[PDB]
């Protein structure tokens, strides 16, 4: 029928969670008619659009939501023609409706250039009493400090799994699918603290297989397995160079892994492996260099051999220290 995010989107200030100080301050400002221009910034899928849509439906009714709220998003290119186009003409006009300010929801405001953000700074500072902007963005640092200096910012952080699991339990009680502990651990680990990807992965696991366990999530998503990276690190740490190179290139051409994902999972693994500090520094410097060398677009086998090379120098130093 419909995706679960479009079915169970929150519509109330209490239905959005972990932002209780932010939502309390927004409710405090909006009961006293003191709401400023808003700048909601954070990771994707943490409740940026739905919070301001809940606040808009609190402020305005269903009939006047389409009139006193203008929404611009990624479908609109954000250059200099837009800021002298529809958003200026929208902000510089009155309405035949009740005497309240307008609202402009500008999705992905970090994609505006410095000239575009300065023109938007002119538009924001020119019209304040009749228009209250809402710029929502991923990176705060991609916008100018003047724009940060005229609109109040709010950091929509990620959702802690301790607070994330009651909503997952609610959506697994409402929608009857098979739930285990390792499936929920895979959900709250692979989702990376945002509800949108957790609900999408849960719905895709329901529609693809039917049950939600750890290996079903891993096979539906393609995330590297923990025992897979354990085998990669074991081959790098206690095998010969040609043996490890052949084993890891067969695992790469079999499992569909890539060297960037191997690099980040090995980077997460080597801070669990209790190395001495010096060989930890050597491994981290070498792996960051391999990440940059893969970023600049070189051959992949040679960088794989350099990763095995760093771990072979590591294993020589570890045995020599033993």
């Amino acid at each position: 029928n419909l995706p679960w995010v479009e079915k169970y989107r929150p519509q109330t200030l209490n239905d959005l969670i972990s932002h209780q100080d932010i939502l309390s301050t927004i409710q405090k400002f909006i009961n006293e008619d003191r709401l400023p221009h808003l700048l909601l910034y954070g990771p994707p899928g943490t409740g940026k659009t739905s919070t301001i849509l809940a606040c808009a439906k609190q402020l305005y009714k269903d009939k006047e939501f389409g009139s006193m709220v203008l929404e611009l998003n990624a479908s609109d290119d954000r250059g200099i023609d837009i800021i002298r186009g529809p958003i200026l003409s929208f902000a510089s006009t009155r309405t035949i409706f009740k005497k309240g300010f307008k609202l402009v929801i500008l999705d992905e405001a970090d994609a505006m250039t410095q000239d575009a953000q300065n023109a938007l700074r002119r538009v924001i500072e020119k019209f304040t009493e009749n228009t209250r902007f809402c710029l929502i963005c991923n990176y705060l640092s991609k916008i100018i400090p003047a724009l940060q200096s005229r609109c109040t910012r709010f950091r929509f952080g990620p959702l802690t799994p301790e607070l994330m699991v009651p909503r997952l339990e609610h959506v697994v009680e409402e929608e009857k699918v098979d739930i285990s502990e390792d499936g929920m651990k895979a959900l709250v680990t692979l989702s990376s603290g945002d509800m949108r990807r957790a609900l999408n992965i849960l719905q895709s696991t329901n529609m693809a297989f039917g049950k939600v366990t750890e290996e079903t999530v891993y096979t539906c998503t393609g995330h590297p397995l923990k025992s897979d990276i354990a085998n990669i690190l074991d081959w790098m740490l206690n095998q010969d160079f040609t043996t490890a190179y052949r084993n890891i290139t067969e695992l790469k051409t079999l499992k569909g892994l890539a060297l960037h994902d191997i690099l980040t999972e090995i980077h997460l693994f080597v801070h669990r492996v209790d190395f001495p500090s010096s060989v930890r520094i050597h491994l981290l410097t070498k792996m960051a260099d391999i990440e940059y060398r893969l970023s600049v677009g070189t051959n992949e086998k040679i960088q794989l051999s350099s990763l095995i090379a760093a771990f072979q120098v590591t294993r020589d130093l570890i045995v020599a220290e033993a």
Binding site: T93, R94, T95, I96
Partner: protein
Amino acid sequence: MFEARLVQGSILKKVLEALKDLINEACWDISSSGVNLQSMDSSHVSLVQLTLRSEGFDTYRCDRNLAMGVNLTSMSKILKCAGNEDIITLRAEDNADTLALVFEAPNQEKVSDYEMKLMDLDVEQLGIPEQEYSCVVKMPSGEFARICRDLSHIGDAVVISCAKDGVKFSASGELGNGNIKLSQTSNVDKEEEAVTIEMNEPVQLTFALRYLNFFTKATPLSSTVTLSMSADVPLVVEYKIADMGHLKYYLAPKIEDEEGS
């Protein structure tokens, strides 16, 4: 089954040029009282109400309420097709996707059936508060059109001041200030120049220029114009067009500057 017949064809051929450039579509609502048309502009500033009662028509057949959405771009060229003193009829079926405008050609020899499609437009009625207006002015229509054409040469936002003395239309631009004040024109032979003030408390509202020009595009509908304004109520421009009904324009003021001391 909707059937309407006008007495003279020039009613539509004066009322639809006022909607040629102002609004983009037309929302005809049918009822036993007659036909109405409420449309908000695309910029959500200008509002047009058109109410034509059933007694003004030559004949009027309707059974249930109908909501109808039409495009004014082709209708604003189809107004040039009809004559001035011919008899026009609007015909609409129950389940059809096309409406017929049946009248006579300007040759007075040829029956003209112009068929126009329906745009299924999802619009909702705003609902006018219809509050007690703090200042009512009765003025001529051509005088208002020529004063908007006069202040179109000075600034892009006129200022209407309404006190017990009367109305002051003032335009300030890069050229220089120009103000025009009217008072007490009851000493005339014709009854259409009675520029009358009907309320006491003064108001001072700044309006856009192009919107008032689009409003004054409807001069030959009637002889007099009722301008209603208040402190926060929008400007209301009321035309008592003939005997079949009336027309209303609603205009929000401009945003005032931060002139606090």
